[PDB]
Amino acid sequence: SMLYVSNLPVGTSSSAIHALFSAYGNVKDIWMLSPDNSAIVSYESLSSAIVARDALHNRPVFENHGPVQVMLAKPS
Amino acid sequence: SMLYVSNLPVGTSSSAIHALFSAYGNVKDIWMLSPDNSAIVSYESLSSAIVARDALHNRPVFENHGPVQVMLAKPS
Ligand SMILES: [Cl-]
Q1: Are the CB atoms for A41 and A27 separated by under 8 Å?
Q2: Of B8, B14, B36, B44, which one has the fewest beta carbons inside 10 Å?
C-alpha cells in the first residue's frame, strides 16, 4: 500500500521517515522525492497505511515546521 | 522504478495514465492520488522510467492538455 507524504521539512532523511511511519506497521520501502519535499512510503498491509494516514495527515509532528500531509493512494 | 506524476488534468483516469506511460515501457502498477491531480507509476525497468521522464517533459498529453510533471523517486 502506498502513501504519498508531502510538506516534509527540507532535508528530511529516509531514516527519519522510517522512524515516523514504523510506529504503525511494517514499512517495506521508502522512495524519496527531495526536490518536492516529499516521499513515498509502502506498507506490507493496507490496514497499516490507513492507520498511519489517520494518525499523521495534516499534523506538524516536526517542531518549527508546517504540517505534514499524508495521502493514501488508490491502487489500479 | 517509481515515478511521481503530477499536474494531471483534473479527472484523468488510470486507464488514460496507463495508456500514456505504456508508450515507454511495461507499466507494472498505477496508484491514483486524484485529490492532488497526481499519480504514482511503476515500471518493470529503470530505463523506461527515465525515457518516460525525459520524453514527457514539456509534451502536451491527454488531448493536447498541459504537460505533466514527472519526477523519478529514488529508492532507499
Ligand atoms: Cl504492515
Answers
A1: yes
A2: B44
Looking at CA atoms only, how far is residue A36 from chain B in angstroms?
9
CA distance linking residue B61 with residue B47, whole number of Å: 21
- Chain A residue at shortest CA distance from B30: A76
- For this PDB entry, the determination method is X-ray
Describe the crossing of helices A14-21 and A46-56 by its angle, rounded to 10 degrees. 100
- Contact status, residue B31 vs residue B40, Cβ threshold 8 Å: yes
Residue identified by cell 507499466 is B27
Q: Which residues of B touch A29 (CB under 8 A)?
A: 75-76
In 3D, which of A12, A63, A22, A17 has the Cα closest to residue A44?
A22
SS3 A52: helix
Resolution value (Å, 1 decimal): 2.1
SS3 content of chain B, % helix, strand, coil (to 5): 30, 35, 35
